[PDB]
Design an enzyme around this catalytic site. Structure first.
Site, PDB file in Angstrom:
ATOM      1  N   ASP D  26       0.817  -1.180   0.000  1.00 51.62           N
ATOM      2  CA  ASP D  26       0.000   0.000   0.000  1.00 51.62           C
ATOM      3  C   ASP D  26       0.854   1.234   0.000  1.00 51.62           C
ATOM      4  O   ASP D  26       1.344   1.687   1.047  1.00 51.62           O
ATOM      5  CB  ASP D  26      -0.838   0.014   1.286  1.00 51.62           C
ATOM      6  CG  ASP D  26      -1.636   1.283   1.473  1.00 51.62           C
ATOM      7  OD1 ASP D  26      -1.759   2.069   0.521  1.00 51.62           O
ATOM      8  OD2 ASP D  26      -2.083   1.528   2.635  1.00 51.62           O
ATOM      9  N   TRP D  51       4.874  -5.509   7.875  1.00 50.23           N
ATOM     10  CA  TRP D  51       3.655  -6.253   7.924  1.00 50.23           C
ATOM     11  C   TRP D  51       3.866  -7.295   6.883  1.00 50.23           C
ATOM     12  O   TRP D  51       4.705  -7.124   6.008  1.00 50.23           O
ATOM     13  CB  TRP D  51       2.480  -5.424   7.583  1.00 50.23           C
ATOM     14  CG  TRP D  51       2.318  -4.903   6.179  1.00 50.23           C
ATOM     15  CD1 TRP D  51       1.418  -5.346   5.239  1.00 50.23           C
ATOM     16  CD2 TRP D  51       3.004  -3.732   5.574  1.00 50.23           C
ATOM     17  NE1 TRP D  51       1.596  -4.646   4.134  1.00 50.23           N
ATOM     18  CE2 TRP D  51       2.485  -3.607   4.322  1.00 50.23           C
ATOM     19  CE3 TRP D  51       4.060  -2.946   6.012  1.00 50.23           C
ATOM     20  CZ2 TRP D  51       2.953  -2.582   3.521  1.00 50.23           C
ATOM     21  CZ3 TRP D  51       4.584  -1.934   5.185  1.00 50.23           C
ATOM     22  CH2 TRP D  51       3.977  -1.726   3.942  1.00 50.23           C
ATOM     23  N   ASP D  70       8.828  -0.090   4.860  1.00 48.25           N
ATOM     24  CA  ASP D  70       8.732   1.240   4.315  1.00 48.25           C
ATOM     25  C   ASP D  70      10.076   1.947   4.281  1.00 48.25           C
ATOM     26  O   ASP D  70      10.917   1.732   5.151  1.00 48.25           O
ATOM     27  CB  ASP D  70       7.802   2.061   5.080  1.00 48.25           C
ATOM     28  CG  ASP D  70       6.386   1.654   4.829  1.00 48.25           C
ATOM     29  OD1 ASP D  70       6.077   0.977   3.831  1.00 48.25           O
ATOM     30  OD2 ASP D  70       5.581   1.973   5.668  1.00 48.25           O
ATOM     31  N   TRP D 102       4.244   2.100   8.433  1.00 50.76           N
ATOM     32  CA  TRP D 102       5.118   1.227   9.120  1.00 50.76           C
ATOM     33  C   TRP D 102       6.561   1.699   9.035  1.00 50.76           C
ATOM     34  O   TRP D 102       7.395   0.953   8.545  1.00 50.76           O
ATOM     35  CB  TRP D 102       5.068  -0.185   8.551  1.00 50.76           C
ATOM     36  CG  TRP D 102       3.810  -0.954   8.939  1.00 50.76           C
ATOM     37  CD1 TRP D 102       2.848  -1.336   8.099  1.00 50.76           C
ATOM     38  CD2 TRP D 102       3.504  -1.522  10.176  1.00 50.76           C
ATOM     39  NE1 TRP D 102       1.915  -2.074   8.740  1.00 50.76           N
ATOM     40  CE2 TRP D 102       2.274  -2.159  10.041  1.00 50.76           C
ATOM     41  CE3 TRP D 102       4.101  -1.490  11.412  1.00 50.76           C
ATOM     42  CZ2 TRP D 102       1.673  -2.806  11.053  1.00 50.76           C
ATOM     43  CZ3 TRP D 102       3.493  -2.109  12.428  1.00 50.76           C
ATOM     44  CH2 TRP D 102       2.278  -2.745  12.260  1.00 50.76           C
ATOM     45  N   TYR D 113       6.104   8.712   4.808  1.00 50.69           N
ATOM     46  CA  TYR D 113       6.052   7.584   3.911  1.00 50.69           C
ATOM     47  C   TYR D 113       6.543   7.983   2.564  1.00 50.69           C
ATOM     48  O   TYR D 113       5.957   8.879   1.937  1.00 50.69           O
ATOM     49  CB  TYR D 113       4.615   7.070   3.768  1.00 50.69           C
ATOM     50  CG  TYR D 113       4.528   5.944   2.761  1.00 50.69           C
ATOM     51  CD1 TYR D 113       4.844   4.648   3.147  1.00 50.69           C
ATOM     52  CD2 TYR D 113       4.263   6.193   1.432  1.00 50.69           C
ATOM     53  CE1 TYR D 113       4.866   3.602   2.244  1.00 50.69           C
ATOM     54  CE2 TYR D 113       4.274   5.150   0.518  1.00 50.69           C
ATOM     55  CZ  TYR D 113       4.607   3.861   0.932  1.00 50.69           C
ATOM     56  OH  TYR D 113       4.596   2.793   0.094  1.00 50.69           O
ATOM     57  N   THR D 116       7.520   1.547  -0.402  1.00 53.78           N
ATOM     58  CA  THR D 116       7.606   0.234   0.207  1.00 53.78           C
ATOM     59  C   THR D 116       8.393  -0.741  -0.593  1.00 53.78           C
ATOM     60  O   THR D 116       8.205  -0.822  -1.803  1.00 53.78           O
ATOM     61  CB  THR D 116       6.224  -0.331   0.308  1.00 53.78           C
ATOM     62  OG1 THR D 116       5.458   0.616   1.048  1.00 53.78           O
ATOM     63  CG2 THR D 116       6.177  -1.646   1.032  1.00 53.78           C
TER      64      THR D 116
END
Ligand code: HEC
Ligand code: HEC
Ligand code: HEC
Ligand code: HEC
Ligand SMILES: [Ca+2]
Ligand SMILES: [Ca+2]
Ligand code: NA
Ligand code: NA
Ligand code: NA
EC number: 1.4.9.1
Lengths: 131, 354, 376, 125, 376, 357
Positions: D26, D51, D70, D102, D113, D116
């Site tokens: 995400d 995750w 991340d 995260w 962010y 990822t």
């Protein structure tokens, strides 16, 4: 929608970039972020600086001085973006130049650009560079 | 009626019989050859004017009467800004109310009272005919009606096209009859995009039909005392000219030090400048505004004295929002402005531009 | 069907014609009312973000509020103020972090408070309305913290000051029910009631576990603070309703938003704010579509409307657009707001017929969250 | 392209949202802003938090655990945005929840962010 | 044929198959080289912005740098650092303004200096590359100040400090020629030469007025600091070239980039960075199309390439896209970079043939400024 | 050879004739009934083991030999990380180099020298026969050869499947023969998404064929001195166990206090924990990690003592980047990790879990 074609001013919708008073607007139409044609949205700070353009009103066939003013101290609205450059001159003729963030004299030293208003302040004269 | 009233005013205006020693008319201080201002050198030069008694100097510069008839009557608008009136401090509501005040002011025309004004009017057979045809039989035998009638005639005279002809170059250019020079157009562009237009334009937006280059508001632009005029006025070095606040009825201390935005029409020929005639040159008056914008040493200094402008006579209520524009006028923009301002000279005074 | 922009042109042309003067100035937004709607644009995790204040009746932007990184908006239900918890950094997305709460006047939009939160305590997450929440009196804002462990931060908006972090169990979301009380949803399938003072170990009580470990409760349940109703869909459109009005949790009967045939044909809820609840009508709205079971955050093109009490389907609207979030004005004859993150457009619908009425486009970059006040 | 259709993994392009390892990504694929499949771009800070998801690899018929991490401390890249949610559970099962930023453990306390990465940490079970 | 993403998938599949382990880490960007191109996104005046670091050869983003409001990017020609002058506010777009210069390591992209600029002296304007400029030694950054009057700020990158403001006349832009001198373009149509010491008013000299009042010189000249070549197009595609390489200004034959009949059939330069100058090839590239005279900021779909010496048209490319900005790599067989603000896409062209090689999409919101290093 | 070498090691491994007073074999401290660790109580409990003299105590906990054969030989990888080796400080390169050291350590089996070791091997006709068959006639007459051959035999024996059977529940679940209990699967999930995985997994990414739950690296996790063990070992109140820095040839002061990440196989059965056996309970070893993350005061307190964990023995070079994860393990997650770690118990030691549980 032909970006390079000559600008065809209308007097029927202030939210469209072909609205006659927006003839040298650069940014965003304040009417689309809770201002109006000649008033800033809530929260923003009206600058006292301006750049001017002589804009043709198709309705009465007259040319009017629009002294654009920035509403400052908010991030850019992102609604009704517009860039026109009728009679717009380079930065060394700042009085006609529209890349400048004209936020001078805004309360609280606000200097960020939110949107631009398009009020009339004269009936040209004219100018030499642009009639 | 309207012609004839004004023609009466025209007589009165030049009649020194309305002064105690019969040595002074309105025209002595509002000399038509000097856009209705005082060419007469006194103790403080041309900053202030001398009255009928030959000694008494005022504490303010005599303003032009040109275009004074376009000023609305004194009122507070819905935004709480006072507008209009006559005198530099708007203490007179309108021209009619202003007209009798020189006549009775001991430091000006110095007539003792309305009755003595009336008696001088009776001495002149022409007045007895003139005033009687307009205001009726016996008007001059009644001091109140006499003095009010004289005041109305004067006001009507000031409202004639002679006082506000709108025949400056600026007027001809706005009618498409003529073009500004490059420098004058630059000056105009600067004038309407810079802070000047925030006060020296009739309207906030749209187009005025009879622009007189004032919004008729009251602003404290932070001016210093004119030491030599103040010495000459004899009001004392303890004196503070509170501007609008001196108008009876105005109590708001926010109005201390505020004066009426003068029409810039004929400004080129009505030096010295500002309510106290502190600046002899127009250029100086423009330069004064840079003191709020320019970070440069030369901006703290009055170029006429070589010394610092001086502290404001009234240090509060400065219109800083307008004056601290964030931009200073360079020499070329000052030139441009002087040029533009000279375009606001009525036709008949264009010869005076040197 | 004369537009905003057309009426303005007409009006302006008339003032020029009439020689009408006006002072350019800063407008006040119109008074907050039931049809005011706020759209927050978390802008797909951008460092700075925008909220658009919208007159839903007119379909007009009446203001905007700047924000930082994944701010959490809250709107006082009575219209007195709006606020957010936000995060900025000294050099755009790096350097010293400052979390803060701003409170804003809802007509001038000016900040009336700016309250630092110490030690950068906000939970940074795709925006879940119920991860920052006002107490009913408007005097406290409660914000969730996940790191180092679940906790909740208490901010005094009346005194304009951060108060304290509260230690909580392994729970999530913040549904305030009183000036000093809120519920959370726990990992163990219970709700947790948390009652807190100026100091002391909070009183924490759990309900019975109300769902099995394989039934997944969405991140955007609808909570009406004024009704104490928590409406909590599962992945399948099973809708848990929890009545918190008594101050303790009572579990209402479960309803299915979709039929058995619809479910067997792949219908499931999906999007971001998938569910809305209209307090006065006691009606649930649920964004649904045919979808694979793991496409639960995709847009949906259909809104089922169901009676909260009975589960009876009242309508199935074909929204005509890709909708990620819905909400409703809380007045009579509500507007059903249908926000498309992909179109960056708030579509404003009649909530009774489903008909699209008007729309407000150019709402940022990835707008996801609709907030209305419940002013009645 | 049908957003609501069952996600169909591929093992032929990592910049695409249907790349097999991205089954619960995400945000943005770091490979599109100067990182790679399992490395962060210059100037960013690599989180230690993660995750997971179990993502089917159509190259080998096996499902692997992808523990996403991340890259933090930069504003969001704006390139190759994707959101997939295979096996993604709500925030109360945070180890499988992907709306959370995260970024914990990232150097200099970086918490914004950027993008990822999608590294494999085991075979499913 | 195989794309970056495809090759990366095969590499990753091979690593998994071979059992190859590898440590997740922060990558270093490839050494700065001729084919590195930077794209700055002023983002249509957004309060925060992005710079993209792109390897023009592979058409790959190799990193990014965050910026504030309308920052001025500078890239040291020798590849040893990049820097910007930027502006942030304590609450997104409001509150206390900090202007600052950051210098970055060009492989780690880490900031190696952050130098505060006192009294918020920066000029906020749609981005003009030559409103902030490195001296040739790389030791000093000069930035233009407009308010209260034209001025130039001197920033010592070596000491990492701001030194002072220089009073200049009514002039614009900054083209440093030496460690203590730079030229600016004046209202009266001269260039001004400004030599500053450590103290005192600088020494200012004016060239001859070199254009009339009604010849309009664009905001984005191309300047090659190494060649001392200032290339300055007017609105009609007329091009001044000024040579500053001896310390004083000398005026090369004005050249015309368009033909009378083109002009007559409506061709004029148009866009943002309308011009590029390739130093080693002595060659000018001008963005042009058929446009009205006051549409001078619109995209063009043609570039004409002309010899700087002769004025001869060497090529006219049909770009096949709406292009706002161009630049070129400074190496042999240069890329011609064509940045579409509209498409947010950097189209990377063989500068010789004009064919489109590859492109890099998703470059922010309204990317406008291309910078390259002149490393040769 | 391979069978037979191992079979010789088997015999040596349990032979107490390799200790001065003949009280002690490898199997005394590395007891096969206890996943090759020391069940015997000494003056610091089970923290440290007692040598053949009956009095001398070590300063470090006796580690399992299970899975020790998967550890690579000691090396510095290209990232400047040291890896592998034997002993908690990696001071031995591999099993073979390790195997002689207990024999000659006066604190352990305490033979005086290699010659005395060889003299023992010669007293035994089965060793004469076994050693000679694999290493040639006369091997037992040459103390250097006999000692080296004994080490080889012992290293071979440790490399047998008996030591590393991979038949733990985790192994069966990974083959698909069973499933984790729900608590175990959560433990597994946490293990692999929290910071444990940055150290207690063989690889940084990808899949290990024979996972032993260690990256073989060296990390100072900021453990306090185990006072009672340190008292028992006699090394002194001012002694500092420098971990890897003690390996001859390591001089880098950045290695001070770093120890080899242990395999977490059989961890449930091999307490007490850490290099100095400071924590008796598996749950405590896990909770220690919350000292770097939790803001709760309890996280600074050793639940076994009720006192602060203590100052690190070596306050520098802590693995703070991995340790300070910003996330605290709640009790549900610690319980889950316990359950998961217990799945790492070899089939034959499953019955030992009952008592641990
Ligand atoms: C002795 C010099 C002198 C004489 C005589 C005189 N004036 Fe004035 N006039 C002034 C001065 C000084 C002011 C400004 C006074 C002030 O602001 O308090 C003034 C102001 C005025 C104003 C206000 C103008 C403005 O813009 O505010 C009017 C109207 C006026 N005079 C009319 C007359 C008339 C009519 C007469 C003849 C009855 C007259 N004056 C006689 C000196 C004089
Ligand atoms: C804040 C309102 C305001 C602004 C802005 C302002 N003015 Fe004025 N100006 C005045 C007022 C009020 C006076 C009379 C002040 C006094 O005498 O106390 C005045 C006086 C003048 C005078 C003297 C006229 C006379 O008859 O004595 C000149 C000339 C003038 N201003 C020009 C300018 C120019 C040119 C600008 C723009 C650079 C400017 N002003 C900006 C309010 C303003
Ligand atoms: C007195 C008890 C004792 C005896 C007897 C002993 N060991 Fe050990 N063992 C230890 C201790 C204590 C350590 C850790 C010492 C250290 O790290 O410095 C150890 C460590 C080892 C290690 C390294 C394991 C690791 O993971 O680092 C190996 C292999 C080993 N022993 C094998 C043997 C063999 C083979 C024998 C018989 C020749 C033996 N041990 C006899 C107590 C003993
Ligand atoms: C920074 C690397 C690192 C991280 C992260 C770490 N460990 Fe460890 N672990 C070690 C090292 C090193 C040792 C041995 C320390 C010593 O004795 O000095 C160890 C020892 C242990 C032991 C004792 C094993 C034994 O045989 O004595 C257990 C149990 C353990 N770790 C569990 C975990 C768990 C569960 C996590 C996740 C919460 C974790 N570790 C995170 C490095 C780490
Ligand atoms: Ca005067
Ligand atoms: Ca142990
Ligand atoms: Na008064
Ligand atoms: Na102890
Ligand atoms: Na050493």
């Amino acid at each position: 929608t032909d970006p390079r074609a000559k600008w065809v001013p209308q007097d029927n919708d202030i939210q469209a970039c072909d609205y006659w008073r927006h003839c040298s607007i650069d940014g965003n139409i304040c009417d689309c972020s809770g201002g109006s044609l000649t008033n800033c949205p809530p929260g923003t700070k009206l600058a006292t600086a301006s750049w001017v353009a002589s804009c043709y009103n198709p309705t009465d066939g007259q040319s009017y001085l629009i002294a654009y003013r920035d509403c400052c101290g908010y991030n850019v609205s992102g609604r009704c973006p517009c860039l026109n450059t009728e009679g717009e001159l380079p930065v060394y003729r700042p009085e006609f130049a529209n890349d400048i963030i004209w936020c001078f004299g805004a309360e609280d030293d606000a200097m960020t650009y939110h949107c631009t208003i398009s009020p009339i302040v004269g009936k040209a004269s004219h100018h030499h560079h642009h009639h | 009626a309207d012609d004839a009233l004004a023609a009466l005013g025209a007589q009165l205006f030049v009649d020194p019989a309305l002064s105690r020693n019969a040595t002074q008319s309105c025209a002595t201080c509002h000399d038509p050859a000097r856009a209705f201002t005082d060419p007469r050198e006194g103790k403080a030069g041309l900053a202030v004017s001398v009255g009928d008694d030959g000694q008494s100097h005022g504490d303010r510069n005599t303003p032009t009467l040109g275009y004074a008839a376009l000023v609305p009557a004194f009122h507070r608008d819905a935004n709480g800004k006072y507008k209009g009136g006559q005198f530099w401090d708007g203490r007179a509501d309108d021209l009619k109310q202003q007209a009798g005040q020189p006549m009775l002011n001991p430091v000006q025309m110095a007539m003792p009272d309305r009755a003595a004004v009336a008696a001088r009017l009776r001495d002149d057979p022409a007045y007895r005919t003139g005033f009687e045809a307009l205001f009726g039989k016996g008007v001059l035998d009644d001091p109140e009606r006499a003095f009010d009638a004289a005041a109305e005639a004067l006001a009507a005279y000031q409202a004639t096209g002679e006082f506000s002809p709108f025949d400056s170059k600026y007027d001809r250019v706005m009618r498409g009859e003529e073009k500004f020079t490059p420098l004058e157009e630059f000056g105009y562009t600067v004038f309407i995009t810079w802070n000047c237009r925030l006060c020296h334009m009739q309207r906030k937006q749209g187009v005025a039909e009879r622009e007189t280059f004032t919004n008729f508001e009251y602003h404290n632009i932070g001016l210093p005392v004119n030491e030599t005029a103040r010495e000459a006025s004899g009001l004392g070095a303890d004196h503070v000219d509170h501007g609008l606040l001196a108008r009876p009825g105005i109590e708001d201390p926010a109005q201390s030090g505020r004066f009426k935005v003068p029409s810039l029409r004929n400004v080129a020929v009505t030096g010295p400048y500002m309510h106290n005639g502190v600046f002899t040159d127009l250029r100086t008056a423009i330069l004064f505004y840079n003191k709020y914008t320019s970070r440069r040493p030369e901006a703290k200094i009055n170029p006429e004295t070589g010394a610092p402008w001086g502290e404001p006579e009234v240090a509060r209520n400065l219109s800083l929002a307008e004056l601290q524009s964030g931009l200073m006028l360079d020499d070329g923009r000052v030139d441009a402005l002087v040029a533009f301002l000279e375009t606001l000279t009525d036709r008949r005074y264009e010869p005076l531009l040197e | 069907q004369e537009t905003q922009g057309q009426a303005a042109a007409r009006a302006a042309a008339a003032d020029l014609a009439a020689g009408q003067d006006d002072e350019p100035r800063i407008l006040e937004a119109p008074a907050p009312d039931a049809r005011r709607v706020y759209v927050n644009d978390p802008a797909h995790f951008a460092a700075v973000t925008q909220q658009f204040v919208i007159d839903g009746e007119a379909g007009r932007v009446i203001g905007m509020i700047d924000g930082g990184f994944l701010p959490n908006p809250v709107v006082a239900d009575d219209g007195s103020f709006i606020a957010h918890a936000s995060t900025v950094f000294s050099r755009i997305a790096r350097g010293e972090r400052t979390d803060y709460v701003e409170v804003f006047d809802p007509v001038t939009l000016l900040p009336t408070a700016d309250i630092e939160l110490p030690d950068a305590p906000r939970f940074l997450v795709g925006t879940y309305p119920w991860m920052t929440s006002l107490t009913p009196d408007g005097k406290t804002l409660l914000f969730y913290q996940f790191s180092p462990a679940p906790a909740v931060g208490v901010v005094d908006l009346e005194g304009k000051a951060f108060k304290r972090m509260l230690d909580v169990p392994d729970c999530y979301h913040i549904f305030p029910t009183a000036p000093d009380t809120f519920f959370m949803h726990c990992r163990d399938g219970s709700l947790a009631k948390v009652a807190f003072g100026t100091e002391g170990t909070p009183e924490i009580t759990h309900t019975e576990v109300f769902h099995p470990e394989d039934e997944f409760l969405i991140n955007h349940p609808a909570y009406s603070q004024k009704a104490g109703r928590l409406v909590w869909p599962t992945y399948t459109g099973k809708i848990h309703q929890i009545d918190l009005s008594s101050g303790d949790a009572k579990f209402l009967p479960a309803v299915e938003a979709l039929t058995e045939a619809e479910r067997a044909d792949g219908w499931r809820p999906g999007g971001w704010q998938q569910v809305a609840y209209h307090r006065a009508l006691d009606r649930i709205y649920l964004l649904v579509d045919q979808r694979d079971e793991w496409r639960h955050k995709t847009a949906s093109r259909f809104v089922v409307v169901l009676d909260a009490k009975t589960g009876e389907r009242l309508a199935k609207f074909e929204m005509g657009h890709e909708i990620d979030s819905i909400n409703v004005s809380q007045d009579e004859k509500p507007l059903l707001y249908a926000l498309s993150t992909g179109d960056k457009t708030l579509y404003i619908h009649d909530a009774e017929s489903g008909e699209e009425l008007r729309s407000v486009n150019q709402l940022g970059h990835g707008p996801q969250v609709i907030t209305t006040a419940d002013m009645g």
